């Protein structure tokens, strides 16, 4: 007198501008979900992947990028990346075989990179054929502590930050698919972005206390893309746990979460004394900026055990809306 | 009827713990008691949780030893076979203290005893079935008027590729240029679920004419279990590799001098666990996460009960464990090009000393006070007291009421503090204020029946709970303050409705809420006054059986209410766990020979072929069977 449930195959055509929210869920709980928020109606729909496909998304969705009307969702602990239609949410394809996929960066319609953690290789795939095509061997990296995270492209080169137990940025030549250069910076850079001045901002987390690798004050770095040299370093206070640095549509104001939500012009010579949003007893975990109107969405995971909520604030800091999403939102994707 | 003054403990029947050879040990608790057991597979991570209580407050005792390895304060119950236990009580709540402290939920009190069989009684049981599952057990015993010995050994192996219609993940039918055509729920096999387990226990015992008993038992286990790919794991089983080895030993020596009023005993033991975890992939293999962590522990214990006549009884006891850990989780390349490790290595003493006074003025009224002092590491825990009362309401039907109040403390574990990838070594001890009250009932030899109920209520102060950070790893924090009351009921009857028509029955039912009562964490905290996740509101379990001469049959059933996979307890399509109704049944026929006793039995699990879920994302097998053949003296 008990059963399992399958089905609930819903179908719906959704708006043009929207915001996707990936929900990590709990490790080995396969409760990761995808949410979709409509800024024009202030209505959010949760678990859209399961409702549209009839089966669970997987276990640890990490991030999402959209290329040509198709959204690629990386599911870290499911060894797969799902390609879905950005309008119906129905699965259009998938690529399995990944060690622990992190982020995906497209080079062309037939070539894309997928960074990984717990691997010294960056998986190369062919989005058009939905299969794994190659590997990028990272120097001075083993499987036990290998780590590649975000990627940004600069001409024929691609820069990638090495986060977990690493302290470098790699320079990859996309014409040969091999690592051709590296740069050592603070310990564990968490993210990598490119601004309108061909500058690269990255923020390190300073490791952790008692680490055999290192423990330091995390920092924000400005590195010239052309010369691949560090030009600016803004150190914060030891003990801080900032998030990955992110930029807005015009790429001239960088935002991040430290203990508050900060914002800074990329040309400034010091970190501002005033924050964008004063702390308000909310567990800031995720952050993003609307590339078209500048509205800032802050994702608070709450206790990491129940559905999280996202606050939508205007560029001036006016509360515009708030809505419950999934469990532990940590990444966003604008449509 | 003393030392159980106001004490609530569940005693297990002789054949309740020797029903089937493998049967784990969680499968005995989960069908003759009414506590919660987080469990998915056979060779699974079966954890026991008491009334609204975390498993971290359910600590166990084997022959007086603490088996919960202090690297993480609990005991895995799939690592204990049903046939490797002779005596097993289960002290509930506030009654756990007068044997050892630190048990906020309560204690499982285990001990092996000499079977007291004279001669050579080799006993072999062999069992097959289900998904290529094979189990073997053998016991060689030696009996003597003064010496005694017994050697037991269990080996069980299975691939666990059970067929499941996977309603959790779909598979596609493609065409030219990888345009998706079809999608179906596959009928897959449990990937990387195999297991190979071996146990061996050697015990000897000494007895002289006057009351001087000696005893010694050593226990080796070698476990090699494959971590099942979770249901949404889109990875090849032959590509990936997820292995858990655990080689551990537990040994105990005992000396007991008992005479009339005064009974005294001392014990000394040692455990040593070595846990190896491996997670690898193919490029010709290579390790993704490869770790080895070993802890060894020395024991010292002394208990004594001086009971001057009746109406006064006094117990005293001491248990000191010195632990010695060696953790090592990853090998990293340090900045200097060298090779370094992230594991820590620590160790601390764990002393608990207790004194109790049982006083019964008359047969009706009786009370008792137990008082414990605990000291783990370098810190003296504040006195952990408890007080029991029992009373004979009416001699007709023995209706007896008991009640007891206490204040327990639990120290954080060595992973709770010194975990180097994690952190926060300044954690506060968990505080629990608890108090119970209940009643019991019995009526009698050509017929018999008994039962009782109780009442649970506990406030837990700042208690440990691990939280993710923005850095990708967990750290603990004493944030929540839970409020877990409840109630438990039991009833066992047996009326011989004929010359030989024995009908043995018992059943239990528990209402166990564990509502959160902490600081609302965020302005959107929906879990402020909701029950904690994975804590079933209602639980129940009935086991009944009957005998017709050499033929016997028992049926077991249990129900757990909806297990909330979310702290807020709201409904969610992706994370819904339905109520859990497991039904299983076993039957045996034996037939005695000259100097031997042959038996054949068959057991089923998951009758009705219900396709269900007990832990989120972890599949469960269909209907399964095992058939056993046994020779006994």
Residue numbers in the entry:
A (entry chain D): 32 to 366
B (entry chain C): 45 to 327, 331 to 491, 494 to 682
What did the publication describing this PDB structure actually write?
Contrasting with Enterobacteria, members of the dominant genus Bacteroides often encode several BtuB vitamin B12 outer membrane transporters together with a conserved array of surface-exposed B12-binding lipoproteins. Here we show that the BtuB transporters from Bacteroides thetaiotaomicron form stable, pedal bin-like complexes with surface-exposed BtuG lipoprotein lids, which bind B12 with high affinities. Closing of the BtuG lid following B12 capture causes destabilisation of the bound B12 by a conserved BtuB extracellular loop, causing translocation of the vitamin to BtuB and subsequent transport. We propose that TonB-dependent, lipoprotein-assisted small molecule uptake is a general feature of Bacteroides spp. that is important for the success of this genus in colonising the human gut.
